[PDB]
Every structure is written in C-alpha cells, then in structure tokens.
Design an enzyme around this catalytic site. Structure first.
Site, PDB file in Angstrom:
ATOM      1  N   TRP E  51     100.353 -39.257  42.784  1.00 45.90           N
ATOM      2  CA  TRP E  51      99.642 -39.016  44.037  1.00 45.90           C
ATOM      3  C   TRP E  51      98.583 -40.050  44.083  1.00 45.90           C
ATOM      4  O   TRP E  51      98.069 -40.469  43.089  1.00 45.90           O
ATOM      5  CB  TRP E  51      99.234 -37.615  44.448  1.00 45.90           C
ATOM      6  CG  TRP E  51      98.049 -37.194  43.676  1.00 45.90           C
ATOM      7  CD1 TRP E  51      96.752 -37.270  44.019  1.00 45.90           C
ATOM      8  CD2 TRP E  51      98.074 -36.654  42.448  1.00 45.90           C
ATOM      9  NE1 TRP E  51      96.049 -36.790  43.024  1.00 45.90           N
ATOM     10  CE2 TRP E  51      96.824 -36.405  42.061  1.00 45.90           C
ATOM     11  CE3 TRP E  51      99.148 -36.383  41.629  1.00 45.90           C
ATOM     12  CZ2 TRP E  51      96.620 -35.863  40.827  1.00 45.90           C
ATOM     13  CZ3 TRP E  51      98.926 -35.843  40.369  1.00 45.90           C
ATOM     14  CH2 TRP E  51      97.645 -35.566  39.964  1.00 45.90           C
ATOM     15  N   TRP E 102     102.839 -33.572  39.396  1.00 50.67           N
ATOM     16  CA  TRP E 102     103.492 -34.855  39.602  1.00 50.67           C
ATOM     17  C   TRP E 102     104.060 -35.383  38.290  1.00 50.67           C
ATOM     18  O   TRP E 102     103.671 -36.453  37.812  1.00 50.67           O
ATOM     19  CB  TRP E 102     102.524 -35.855  40.246  1.00 50.67           C
ATOM     20  CG  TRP E 102     102.282 -35.593  41.709  1.00 50.67           C
ATOM     21  CD1 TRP E 102     101.124 -35.145  42.287  1.00 50.67           C
ATOM     22  CD2 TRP E 102     103.217 -35.765  42.779  1.00 50.67           C
ATOM     23  NE1 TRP E 102     101.278 -35.037  43.642  1.00 50.67           N
ATOM     24  CE2 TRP E 102     102.555 -35.410  43.973  1.00 50.67           C
ATOM     25  CE3 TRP E 102     104.549 -36.191  42.844  1.00 50.67           C
ATOM     26  CZ2 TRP E 102     103.180 -35.459  45.217  1.00 50.67           C
ATOM     27  CZ3 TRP E 102     105.170 -36.248  44.092  1.00 50.67           C
ATOM     28  CH2 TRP E 102     104.484 -35.880  45.258  1.00 50.67           C
TER      29      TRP E 102
END
Ligand code: HEC
Ligand code: HEC
Ligand code: HEC
Ligand code: HEC
Ligand SMILES: [Ca+2]
Ligand SMILES: [Ca+2]
Ligand code: NA
Ligand code: NA
Lengths: 376, 125, 354, 376, 125, 355
Positions: E51, E102
C-alpha cells in the site's frame, strides 16, 4: 547517548541524500556470540507464544521464533542451532493435539527439522528450562513426560526422528552428562542416574538421599552442562551443589546464600529463574528479597553473588526493578540479565558492579525464561 | 499490593486475588469468563485432576481443602489473573504444585488452560 | 421404643432360629468380629458365602453392615443417576425392605415363607414379650406383621452407633485429636486429588458431616468374572450379573453391569474385594484402577494371578470418563493409599489390621 | 452497589454455612436476549483471537469463543446461532493455511458445524462486520474474497457445505437482502446488486452513482437487515442512507451529523465502528470528535444522536472515555455500547440519556467489533 | 500524545510512530523485531504487494511515495505498534487502504502479519 | 569534439552506404519517425526486421534506441544478478561494442568485413574530413581503426538529448508542470504498488534522477515462440532462443531464457511487443502478466488469437517470485496501466498515440 532508532534515521537519511540503493530483503541475524540472549514468553498460559532473540551487548532484538502452547526452549552451547519442543491444536486451543520438535538455524531462524512426537507426550507446565534438554554432543533432545507417569522421551536430532519413551521412577527434571546419560531429581530425595542405549530398559542408579522431606528444592536450578555443575537452591536459599563431571554424582559442601540473621529478618529467594551460575568464574547469583515464606514466586529486587567453592558473598546488588528471572552470559566481564515479567522487559546489567547498562522492553505478555549459550 | 507481604485472605469478593479459596490458584478465576466459583464456562471442558491446598477461611476460622480444577480446551481467558502459592511445593510434590496444567481427564482430551475453579472438597488435616 | 426396638433386633441378629435348619443367623455371615463380614472359607475362598443348607454358595461377596444405615433410600436424582438402596445391585429400597430377603432366600437362610418365620418367632416366649410390647398383642400370629416387625427391629438395630461409631483414625484426625503420619497424609491427598473422590466421597463439594466414602451411586468399573465364585454359585457359565439392571423396575439399558459404590470404611479388614470378591488383597483392588491409566505392561496383569485381569463381565456402561484419568498410580502412591484406607478402620478392628 | 464478585462471595458463604451441595460442571450461557452483546478482539493482528459474549444488562461475561487470524463474526438476528469465518495455520502463523466456518450453539457455545473453505479464500483485513454476512433466513453465509480478485464465497449453513465462489465487479462489502441477493459498494460510486444461483453467472445490476470520487465512505457502515437500511457515513460525517427494503436501492436524502459550525471547528467522525442504527427508533448514532482530517481511525469521546428521517440532532453525549466502536441493543430503552480498544473495555450506556451504567473490562488485547442480535 | 492532533512528521528516529515514512503505516515497525527500516526480520517472508502513501519528509521538504510492504509468516511482533492514516482511503480504494494485510506474493504463501517496512519507491504526484 | 563526434554519428546513422547493397542504414530499422523502430511490414508483420538483401529476417524484434544510452555497461552485481549491456540478450557490453554488429551481420546490413566498411567510408570525402578531424590522419586506411571510430561516433550520437529528451507527460508531471488525469494517476499508483515496479523501475528503493522504467536486469517471463517470426527467421523448429545464455562467457544454465528488461519509455508507439514481437497490442502485453495470477479461464487465452498463450520457449528459470503476485489485474486497472504507459511517450511522438 544516540539510540538505535536515531542512528538508523541518520543512516537512512544519508542513503537517501547520496542516492544509495539497497534491495528490500530478509535479514540474517548476526552470528551467535556469547552476548546473544533468548527471552521466552509463555504468555501466562496463552495457546501461542513468542521467543525473542536479543543481542545483549547492543540491547537489540535481532529475531523472533513463534511457539505453541508452553514450549520448552533449548539453545546449543556451541551456537550451531536452537530448538524447542512445542504444542499446537487444530482449532487454536481445541481439537487434535500435535506435539513436535523444531530445530532452527540460528542466523536465518529457518526450521531445519520438524519432528512430530507421537501420542502427545509433552509435559505441559509453567516453563522450566530443564524439563527439556540437549545432550552435550547436541545430537539428542530429551523431553519430560508426566502423564500417565514420569517418563523421558528420546529425540534424535541428527536423524530427525522420535526414538522412544524411557520409563523412569518418580523423578523430575533432565540433566544430561553424556550422549547416553542424564540425571533426574526424585521425590524420595535422591538423584537418579539414567543410562540409555540403542534399545532396551535404561540402567537406572540412585544416589544417596541428599536432602530431607521438609527441605524444598526449587523448580529452576541452574545447570552448567560444560562444568557438570548442578546448582540447586532451596526455599530458604540453602544451595545444593552436585558435581556430575566424572559421570557420577559427587555432592559438594552445602552452602548458605543468606546469613542466619537475614533469614530471621525474612530474607528469602523468590521469582522464577532465581539462580544463575557462571562457569568460568565459578560463581553463583541468586534473586533474593524480604518476603513471607509462601510468596516464593513473586519478583525480587535484590541479587546476591557468592563464591561456589567457599560460599563467601562477593556482592549484593539492589536491582532497581521487580525482577523474576536471572541468568548470565558465559564470557569474561559477563552481563547479568534480569527479566521482569510484570514490565515485559529484560534489564541488562554489568555482573561485576550490578549497574544497569541498558534494557529491552515490549517482550510479549509475560516473559519468564532467559537462555544463553556457553560458547567459551 | 505489596507482592512479597504475607497474603491476607478475605471472604467478600471471589473475583479478587485475595479471596480466601484462591490461596494456591494459578491462572484465571473462572467466574470472570462465564463460569462461577465452582463451575466451568460454556464450551470448556472440566478436568478431573486437581491440585490441593489448605486455605484458611477468615470468616469461620476453619481451614478447608480446596481442590483446584482446571477448565480446559480454550485459550487462557485473560480475565482476573492471579498467582498465589500458600503451601505450594515444587513439581516433585505434584499434589501441591501449581505450575502444572491440571487438565488431565478433561473431556475430548482438552489440555489447554482457560481458567481454574475453587471448590471445597474437605476440611484440612 | 427406639432403644427397645434396636434391642429386639439385636436378639434377632444372632438368632439362628430364623434359618430353616437353625444353622445360621445374620451374624454367621455378617460377623461382628470381622466388621460384619464373613470369615468362613468356602468353595471359592472368602469370595462368596455358604447358606443354611451347608452347600449353596452365593454369587456375590458378603458386604459390611457397618455404616449401611447412612445410605439413603433408593431413588433417581435430578441428574438421572440412581442413588442409594441396599445390596450390591440396589434391589432393596432400604434396610427394612432388605432384612427379610436373606430370611427367605434358598441360598441363604432358606425359610420357606413368612409364615415359617412367624412360627419360629412364636416359639420364643421372649419374642412374644418383646414384639407384643412394641407392635401389639397377636403380632406374631400374623405372618405379614411378624415378618415386617422383625425387619423393622433388625433395621433399627443396624442404625445404632455400634454399627456406625465413627471412631476410625480418620475420624480422630478430622476432630483435630491426632495427626496422620506422612505416608497416611500423602494417601489422603492422593485420594482427594485423584479420581477416587469422584465416587468414594459423599458430596461433590463442601464437607460431609458423616463421611462414609461413597456417593451412593452405581458404576460399572469393568471387573471380570470371579471364576471359582461363579462356579461355586451354581448359576452357570452362561450367567451374566447385570447389577442394577436386575432391580425390578429398572429397565434402562445404561444400568447394566453397574453396582453400588461401596463405603470404604473398614475396607482394610473386609477382604476379598468387589461385588464378587475377586481380589483378596487391598493393594490389588487399588492396582485394578491403573489398568485404565497406565501404559506399563504390568498394569494389564493381576498380581494375584500373574495373568491378564480378564475381560469385563459386562462390556458396556463403563465409567470411562471417571476411570480414564490420564494418571498412573506408582507403587509409592499405592502404598500411601493403602496407608490412608487403613485409617478408615473402626477403633475395635484396629487389632485386625495386623 | 454490590458487585457480581461480592454477590457471589455472599452466596458461596451462605452455601458453605448451610452445607449446600452442587456439582462442578459446565455452565450454559443464559438464553440469547436483546441485551446480549458480542465483543470481538482482532488483537492487533495476532494469529489467534477471542470473542467475548456479554450480558449487557448485568455487564457480565457469560461466555467466550476462540478464533484464528482476523476472523469475521456474525450473529443470527433471531438468536438461534452465531458463527464466524476464521483462519488457522499448521505452525501458529506459518505452514499450511486452513480457512473455515464454524457455527455455534448460542447457549453451550459448542461448534455445531465446521465447514472448510477450499483454496484459502478469506479476505484478511482489519475486521469489517459486513465483509461476512448472513442471509435473512440464516441459511447462507456470504464472505468476501479480495485475492486474486473481488469475489463472494457462498456457504450453505443448512447443508453444512461450501457452495461456490461468485465473480463480482470491483466492489466491496456484502449487505444481504434476500436468500439469493446481496448488495456491494463499488469503486465507481454505485452499489452492485448481485442475484445468484448454485451455478451460472449471477445477475449483477448497478445502481446509479450516489457519491463523488472525493467523498470517502467509511469501512464500517451500519446495516439493518430487518429494516433494509444502509447508513453510510463519509469522512466528514455526511451520511448516505440507502433504502433496500423493496429489493432495489432507493436513495434517501443525505443528512449531516455535524453542523456547519462544528465542521468549521474540526469536528469529524473517527474510530472503528463509528456508526450505529436503531431500527425501531429510526435513530443514527455517530462517534465524533475534534480532529485533523487524517486521524479518522483514532478514538472519539462524543456520540451524536440524530433522527434518520429529518437529520435533526436529538442528543450529543460526552462519553467520558476514548471510544473506538459503538453499537446499540435493538429493543425498547436500548443500551448504547461504547468499546475502547485502548482501555480494552466495553462501556455500557443508557442510549436515551447517554449516562454510563456499567463496564466490562479486560476484553483481550485490542477489541474492536461489537455485534448485537435484532430479535425484535 | 494528542491522538486527534494533526500528525507531525520527524526525521530523527525510525522506531517512533511520528517518523516521517510511517505516515500511513498500520501494524508494527520492522526495525523493532530484528528487521530494519527497509528489510524484514529473519524467518519472515517479504511481500511483493504494497500500500502507498505520499509522506512529507521534513528533512528535504519533498513528499515521497512510500510503498509499504509487509513481512509475513510470523505472529505480530508486538513491538513498536503504530497506526497512522495520512491520505489513507477506504477499502474500495485499496492501493491507499491500510487495514488490508498486504502479504500477497510473500514466499511460501505466507499471509500472517508480523511487521511493515517503509521503503521509498518514488516522488509524490 | 563532443558535438562533432555526435554529428559524425548522425551522418553514419542515416547512411545506407554501410550496407552491402546500400539499401539499408540504421535509420531503416531504427526509424526516428517511429521512435527508432521498424515500421516496415515483413513476412511476420512488424515482429521482425528484413535485412539489406531484401529477404533475410531476424528472429528478434527491433527495439527502440531511445534511452538506450542510459543503460550501464554489462556487468554482474554482488547479488549475482547480471545487469546492463545491449541487445535483448546483452551479448554486447555497451553502445560502442553494439554498433559494429548490425554492420557485419549477414541477416542485417551484411557488409562482408571491416575492410569493406573502411572502403565505403574512404569513398566519401565528407567522412575523410570528419573522421580524420576527430581520430587523426589515415584513420580510414586502417580497417580496425575505422570500424572502431564508426562505432564510437554512432555510440556518441545515441547519447544526445535527441534520443533521450525526457519530455514525456510523465516527465512534465514529475516537474510539477502539469498533472495526471484520474485514470493516469490510478495507472501510476497501480504500476508502483503491483509487481511491475520490481522490474520496470531503475532502483530497488529511493528515487531515480533519470528514470527509464527498467532495472536493466535479465528475466524469463515465460513467453512463447513467435511462430511466424520463427518461421521467417529460418532458424528451425528445434531452435531455442536462450537469451542471456547466448552471450559468450555466460555458461550458467540458470540464465537460459532470460532477456533484458526493456525500458517502457515510448512503449505505446513501439508495437509489437516482447523480444520476438509476439504481441501486437499494448493491452495484450499487460494481460500476459495475468496468466501468472488470475484464475479466470480467460487469463490463459491470448485475446489476439483466441488460443492459449502457449508453452514457454524456455520453461525453466521463470521469475515466478515476482510474477506470481497473488493479485489479478481487472479491466479497470489494465485501462489505467495503458493510460499511464501512454504518458511515457516522448513529446514528438504524441501525435502517433492516436493510431
Ligand atoms: C449366607 C450368608 C448371609 C446371611 C445369613 C445374611 N446375609 Fe446379608 N448379605 C449377604 C450377601 C452375599 C450379600 C450381598 C448380596 C447381593 O448384593 O446380592 C448381603 C447383603 C446385605 C445388606 C446390604 C448391604 C449393602 O451395602 O449393600 C444388608 C443390610 C444385609 N445383608 C443384612 C443382613 C441381615 C439383617 C441378615 C439377617 C436377617 C442378613 N443380612 C443375612 C450374606 C448373608
Ligand atoms: C467410577 C467411580 C469410581 C472411581 C473413580 C473409583 N472407584 Fe473404587 N469402587 C467403585 C465401585 C462401583 C466399586 C464396586 C465395584 C464392584 O464391586 O462392582 C468400587 C470398589 C472399590 C474397592 C473395594 C471395596 C469393597 O468393599 O469391595 C476399593 C478398595 C476401592 N474401590 C478404592 C478406590 C480407590 C483407591 C480409587 C482411586 C484410585 C477408586 N476406588 C476409584 C467406584 C469408583
Ligand atoms: C535489419 C534492421 C536493423 C538494422 C539495419 C540495424 N539494427 Fe539495431 N537492432 C535490430 C534488432 C533486430 C535488434 C535486436 C537484436 C538482438 O537483440 O539480438 C537491434 C538492437 C540494437 C541495439 C540494442 C538496443 C537494446 O535495447 O538492446 C542498439 C543500440 C542498436 N540496435 C543500434 C543500431 C545502429 C547504431 C545501427 C546502424 C549501424 C543498427 N542498429 C542497425 C535491427 C536493426
Ligand atoms: C519479473 C520482472 C518483471 C515484472 C514483475 C514485470 N515485467 Fe514487464 N517485462 C519484463 C521483461 C524481462 C520483459 C521482456 C520480455 C521479453 O521479451 O523477453 C518485459 C516486457 C514488457 C512490455 C513490452 C515492452 C516492449 O518494448 O516490448 C511491457 C508493456 C511490460 N513489460 C509491462 C509490464 C507491466 C504493466 C507489469 C506489471 C503488471 C510488468 N511488465 C511486470 C520484466 C518484468
Ligand atoms: Ca469384601
Ligand atoms: Ca517493439
Ligand atoms: Na476366584
Ligand atoms: Na506472429
């Protein structure tokens, strides 16, 4: 005065300024040395747990290892590997139980062996270092079983396989002395010698009883495998010393870690790992404080240091924190490690002066066990 | 609050660590996660193994045997944690030892620690 | 009348006139000198008792009368578990309903009927005096009234302090009068912390006023047949003792093979052990429990025979939850338990302990 | 004024003095009611987690449920069962991953189903209630998959089996409206209506776009399934309301939870579960505080209560604690639940007066998710 | 110490939650468990997924794109926990969303969260 | 001298006198009107280039010369990764070592030898003046000196701002002179959060001064043979293009099937794509990456053919760690990525963006 995070910020800033590139990667832990220290967090009986690998000299966490339910850590003295015996279940804390041993590379922290123990044989208990033990050669791991009866499991680390359970008497703890021999402490007050081979019933010998029934020997004695020194304190701070170096048990003169006056003033050892032994200096370190006789598991604020051979007090340190466990590095000018369960912090002290040098906080939920390798 | 001081029993609050029956409890009081003083929380399994202590009751001046039994098969509750060691002896005297997970005999071979109950099972001596 | 009634029962208890050939009384099989059990050797040793005819043996061990008066009347509690009554299989509701059965049992006292009992009671001038003063004139002329009255007196006699004195070392120790030895104290600790207390304690929790070391429940502990006793019983190799299921009115299949948890008081002097007297030694009875917990090969072997214990007589309704505790009793703990159980011996039988 | 621990101490003493017996056993939780409240503890991304079942009227823990890595809790509105979608690994946080759904009996808390989810399809995220959702009939569980692409998994709770994955457009969240229908919120600012079967491409229809690309709709909207009401705040406390009761999306007039003056002064919503909705009262509750615009995940100390139809403010409560999540009971005289992640404490308020009534502390490591049943 | 105040970046300590590169971090700083600012700790697996956030650097006045990457396959470190959300958007704009684990692309299909690294991948625009 | 060397190179670059039949210059295949690529239709379309003889086809796609001057000289880094050089397989160390090779290659410019090249340069009075002014008198009389000088001149020309103007929309945006559209900005955000950045950005971390959207490394992404191109090249059905392994000196079998990560600058106008020109459309090149991540049946299928992408020409040493990202690019993100890569077009080629 510059902290590691501050020094790290400058290095990162300078890299950015200079246009220095670097590949995001998985770091290796630095080579195991005398000042590496492991802190285990049994996490107040939580179903999963953590181990912290710490550079004691820098006061820096250099790695971690996950464990299941009340794992037993072991560290090979020569630094070649670490291992634990651990316990997991198929649905967190419920379902099918799997007991297993993992061996880890000590720089990559990668599992190099995953050895399942058949029939869920681990003794599940508040972590005692000597309930699971490596042989001096490091090729065999020995774990204690309590249910249905005291028994000792033989795990071949070299061949990566469980071998068998050894039937033993009503005895506790495992102190290895040879590739094929270990000692236990029995309810009757003797030590048991257990000699085990490739196959068959072990050869079990008992020593003479070395303490009475009303003399209580703590769950956390210090054992130097390289010295064959078993240092066992009582609730009153009386210290039993057993030399196992000849392969047979010889009992050293008993010694008092506290004076008669201190004992009458209510001075008593207390904590978890209440005792440490430095091999090179032949020195005993004990966690002590003024306390009621049944507050034997509480933190202590003082450490006394004494000569093993004579029993003369060499120092009394005011630790400055609520300390549960102690241990020492085995090198010259050793560090004294003082772990607070309450603070979740390892305080790192100079063992000669007792002065606090540095600390490592945020170590889990209830850290309790300090382990160091004897590499010298 | 002085951890090292001689433990003082009360008989007015079972969720506090100075309640008289908890004189050798280790872990968590089951009354704080949906059990009660002498009962296990739903979804857990009651062990048959026990550890014992003689706990003095300040109310009637009598000493009772409290057979601590574990509720097992759940992750530790994390509510009302206590450790007391009145008469507690090292592992080689297991009947009086409390670092041991006394989950033996629990249904479904449950062996993880959730919490401990504090039933009276006799008078001391 | 309470004292007079028990006095009458005391007379009846040692009177062989209540057996067909007048060879035995209650006291013959329930010998006051052996804690109200049977010292007589028979075809199967001390395992089962011989009746009035001199040949017939029972299929079950004669239990102590000590403390039986503390057992509640037979019932089913709110947990669905049957409790109380008398006989190993609980087929009698209470002591009163129990007393008349050995009288009319052909393998025991072998009286033809209640009328035969009353006729013998009527032959005794002191029974005419004793009975009529408590139950009224002509009580012995009525077979039903006399027989019921004899049952009442016997039950009342069993309820006196003499059968339940609570003067064991255990009792003295609980009154703060003396201390256990180390071995004895260890044994008590093991008793209350191991599975023993799930069945051999009156209450689940709290303190019992008059502890008799039984919860009055019914359990199948998976005992094998006593071969020689069963042979001596004459009941046949085909026969199966279904315990509580035998009780008239019990229809529940889950009750098959269950028996009343015996009181452990005087256990050290009331061998052999279990409902069929299969084990002569107290230690063996204790070691039987290891068969469900220990993985050691020795735990499969009856030390009295050197052979496997044997398959359960009834291979269902085993109290496995209670029995499979996960912990084996070592020899040291067996020794301690023996030492503890020895403290449940009434004062007057302490000389029997040696 | 007497605490539950004091009442129990009283009762225990009376039992002991009376010689009252009782069998140690496994308790049943009290029958599910309107004032039962569930608190989940994602434990700051710990590999294992806990759910707390609480009686809100007594402020008492009545049960707990273990979970694995970031599980999604659901609760049947009729109180007949609870369930979660959960994730475990063969070696704590490493090794083979098993995704699964468990259904629980609401009083014994025993699992009545354990349904394995093939190919580890769960979306691993900070916990969003509407990333897993029950159909109104309670026969189907719907879970979101993010990787390799947005998809929705269909789990048949009745037949205790995984059914299928549904390909969806670039959309998020799952708000069920029928046994075979749910809505999602899309990147393009529309809602997507998905009408699905056991096989075949589902019928996917977009609503019109209802918001600009620079209005940010929070990850925790309140959805009342029984009302068909989706209450969706933006970062500024503007509230989008969508009426789904007809089976199709009807866009309601937007309301502002904060006045123009308050917004000029820095008032914004903030926390985790920032919004609650009471069906019978038609009321909206919003966690608000004075904050910088990019502190939208921090705790808030105030709740505004407003009429859904008019947008008129009915109250502004000063909570007196750092509150991250709110929800309400769905009965008359409802409770306002106020959960503090930092305090690890559920504060229980009267939703009419805003007054703190009681509290339930020690709720894990980082509790974030409050769930109630709408049994009305 | 004011959680609701505007976040104030610094460039002097990477273990502190106000370190400039941590402007949209969610979880734990990898430096605090045997990693470094841009590297993972031993035994963990580096994700390839990221991200992003534009984070202002107070040393040079530039805004840099920080592509956060998770180190995965270990239980959360529990050391140096931080949560910042500068520019952080809801989940439907996932390239800016930080509640998502993530861990995608991590070796051995590792998906558990241990800690996050903060490497610069470019300048902001 | 710096201006002059480049000016000489400029002359040689468009000079067909450097081919056997004098039909062909660098500019024939590296056409400045098509970002220094070959617009001519051959037997395999625009996938491969036709040499000076009018018949021989190459087996590889003609890459752009734009920004090639930014690639480092061929080397192995401490991480064991080969980097830099020229040609898809990096068999040339740098621009200078490269230049002479098309001149002597019989499938390209087809000059028999260095002496033949020197003879052509000698015939032109402009070259005698320009070469001698830069390299000394008699340079063109020595075939080795003349061939070397020609390569040096051509290398210096490819290093001018003409070849690397850095005037793309992306560049103007990074200077703050204009902004990305929502779609382009989304494309850029995807590019730098997804696996693309691991290979198509100069640096592992930090910011590049002169970004050209390649890390200059070597990777096998698992591309199939271009059948019509492979047929046109005549190399055979049993021929395997080993990429980097084909460089003399490289014996490591792990390098088989790896090719230099191309700069993505001007990608939008340099179709077809990959080392063998297999993909006509830019969208298709992007969609190719989804084969490693998407589970949809369509991810296996080349949209230009309707048939599976194909078996890898080299089915070993694939960069699976980087390629198996776990995340599928949806059509919206493919749209965004197309739009972002279009911002990498130099200003002068923006008019080409329409076609
Ligand atoms: C032939 C020996 C014999 C005689 C005589 C005899 N019994 Fe028994 N008694 C037994 C046996 C055997 C049992 C066990 C029978 C069974 O459980 O099926 C028993 C059981 C009992 C029990 C039940 C105790 C318990 O814990 O279950 C009582 C009470 C009892 N007898 C009392 C008496 C009385 C009173 C008399 C005199 C009327 C008497 N017995 C006559 C052998 C005898
Ligand atoms: C499952 C409940 C249960 C548990 C647990 C249990 N017992 Fe028993 N016990 C019984 C029953 C029922 C009998 C009678 C068995 C029969 O004859 O069928 C019995 C018989 C005995 C006897 C023989 C007494 C006699 O008069 O014949 C002794 C001694 C005994 N038990 C001791 C123990 C000890 C010591 C332990 C702990 C190791 C123990 N028991 C555990 C229920 C139990
Ligand atoms: C027949 C058409 C053709 C002609 C004429 C030609 N080339 Fe090439 N060029 C190619 C092909 C095809 C490749 C790729 C071949 C390979 O990778 O093996 C290439 C590769 C290159 C490269 C490497 C670029 C990179 O990214 O790897 C440079 C530089 C180059 N040529 C410059 C020149 C110069 C200068 C001339 C004039 C002397 C020239 N070329 C003549 C077709 C041609
Ligand atoms: C594993 C490293 C790697 C990753 C990750 C990667 N690429 Fe590539 N890319 C390459 C290599 C190597 C080639 C040359 C392939 C060949 O022809 O052998 C290439 C070729 C291309 C081309 C054709 C360019 C030309 O001039 O022919 C485009 C367009 C492209 N990549 C875009 C992308 C996009 C968009 C992504 C993100 C989805 C991406 N790449 C991910 C290494 C990578
Ligand atoms: Ca007997
Ligand atoms: Ca091309
Ligand atoms: Na026999
Ligand atoms: Na083709």
């Amino acid at each position: 005065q510059e902290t590691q995070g501050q020094a790290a910020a400058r290095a990162a800033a300078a890299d950015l300024a200079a246009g220095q590139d670097d590949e995001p990667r998985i770091l290796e832990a630095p080579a195991p040395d005398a000042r590496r220290v492991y802190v285990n967090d049994p996490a107040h009986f939580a179903a999963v747990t953590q181990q912290f690998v710490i550079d004691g000299e820098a006061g820096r966490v250099i790695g971690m290892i996950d464990g299941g339910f009340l794992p037993n850590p072991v560290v090979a003295d020569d630094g070649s590997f670490i291992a634990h015996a651990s316990t997991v279940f198929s649905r967190i804390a419920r379902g099918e139980r799997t007991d297993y041993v993992e061996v880890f590379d000590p720089v990559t922290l990668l599992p190099t062996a995953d050895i399942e123990l058949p029939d869920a044989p681990r003794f599940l208990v508040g972590t005692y270092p000597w309930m699971t033990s490596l042989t001096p050669d490091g090729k065999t791991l020995l774990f204690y079983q309590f249910s249905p009866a005291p028994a000792v499991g033989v795990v071949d680390l070299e061949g990566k396989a469980f071998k068998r359970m050894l039937d033993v008497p009503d005895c506790y703890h495992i102190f290895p002395t040879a590739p094929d021999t270990f000692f236990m402490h029995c309810r009757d007050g003797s030590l048991a010698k257990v000699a085990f081979g490739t196959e068959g019933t072990p050869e079990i010998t008992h020593t003479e009883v070395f303490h009475p029934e009303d003399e209580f020997l703590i769950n956390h004695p210090a054992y130097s495998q390289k010295a064959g020194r078993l240092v066992w304190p009582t609730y009153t701070g009386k210290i039993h010393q057993i030399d196992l170096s000849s392969g047979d048990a010889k009992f050293l003169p008993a010694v008092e870690a506290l004076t008669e006056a201190e004992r009458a003033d209510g001075w008593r050892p207390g904590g978890w790992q209440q005792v440490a032994y430095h091999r090179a200096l032949d020195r005993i370190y004990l966690l002590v404080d003024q306390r009621d006789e049944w507050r034997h598991k509480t933190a202590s604020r003082f450490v006394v240091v004494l000569d093993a051979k004579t029993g003369e007090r060499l120092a009394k340190f005011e630790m400055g924190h609520e300390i549960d466990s102690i241990n020492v590095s085995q090198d010259e000018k050793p560090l004294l490690y003082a772990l607070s369960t309450g603070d979740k912090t390892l305080y790192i002290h100079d063992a000669e002066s007792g002065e606090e040098l540095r600390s490592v906080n945020q170590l889990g939920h209830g850290p309790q066990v300090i382990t160091t390798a004897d590499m010298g | 609050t002085d951890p090292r001081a001689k433990w003082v029993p009360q008989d007015n609050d079972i969720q506090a660590c100075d309640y008289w029956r908890h004189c050798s409890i280790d872990g968590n009081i089951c009354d704080c996660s949906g059990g009660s003083l002498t009962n296990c929380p739903p979804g857990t399994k009651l062990a048959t193994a026990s550890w014992v202590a003689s706990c003095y009751n300040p109310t009637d001046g009598q000493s009772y045997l409290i057979a601590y039994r574990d509720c097992c098969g759940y992750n530790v509750s994390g509510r009302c944690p206590c450790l007391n060691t009145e008469g507690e002896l090292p592992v080689y005297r297991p009947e009086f030892a409390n670092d041991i997970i006394w989950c033996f005999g629990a249904e479904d071979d449950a062996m993880t620690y959730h919490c401990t109950i504090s039933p009276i099972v006799g008078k001391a001596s | 009348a309470d004292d007079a009634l028990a006095a009458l029962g005391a007379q009846l208890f040692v009177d062989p006139a209540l057996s067909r050939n007048a060879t035995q009384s209650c006291a013959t099989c329930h010998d006051p000198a052996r804690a109200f059990t049977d010292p007589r050797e028979g075809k199967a040793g001390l395992a089962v008792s011989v009746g009035d005819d001199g040949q017939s043996h029972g299929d079950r061990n004669t239990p102590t009368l000590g403390y039986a008066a503390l057992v509640p009347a037979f019932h089913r509690d709110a947990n669905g578990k049957y409790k109380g009554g008398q006989f190993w299989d609980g087929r009698a509701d209470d002591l009163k309903q129990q007393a008349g059965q050995p009288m009319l049992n052909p393998v025991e006292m072998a009286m033809p009927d209640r009328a035969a009992v009353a006729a013998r009671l009527r032959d005794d001038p002191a029974y005419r005096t004793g009975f009529e003063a408590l139950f009224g004139k002509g009580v012995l002329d009525d077979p039903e009234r006399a027989f019921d009255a004899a049952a009442e007196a016997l039950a009342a006699y069993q309820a006196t302090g003499e059968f339940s004195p609570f003067d064991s070392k255990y009792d003295r120790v609980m009154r703060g009068e003396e201390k256990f030895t180390p071995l004895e104290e260890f044994g008590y600790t093991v008793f209350i912390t191991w599975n023993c207390r799930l069945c051999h304690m009156q209450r689940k929790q709290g303190v019992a006023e008059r502890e008799t070391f039984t919860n009055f429940e019914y359990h199948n502990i998976g005992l094998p047949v006593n071969e020689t006793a069963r042979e001596a019983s004459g009941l046949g190799a085909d026969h199966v003792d279904h315990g509580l299921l035998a009780r008239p009115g019990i229809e529940d299949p889950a009750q098959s093979g269950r028996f009343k948890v015996p009181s452990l008081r005087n256990v050290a002097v009331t061998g052999p052990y279990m409902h069929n007297g299969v084990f002569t030694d107290l230690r063996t009875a204790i070691l039987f429990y290891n068969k469900y917990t220990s993985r050691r090969p020795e735990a499969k072997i009856n030390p009295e025979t050197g052979a496997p214990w044997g398959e359960p007589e009834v291979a269902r309704n085993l109290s496995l939850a209670e029995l499979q505790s996960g912990l084996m009793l070592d020899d040291g703990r067996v020794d301690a338990l023996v030492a503890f159980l020895e403290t449940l011996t009434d004062r007057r039988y302490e000389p029997l302990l040696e």
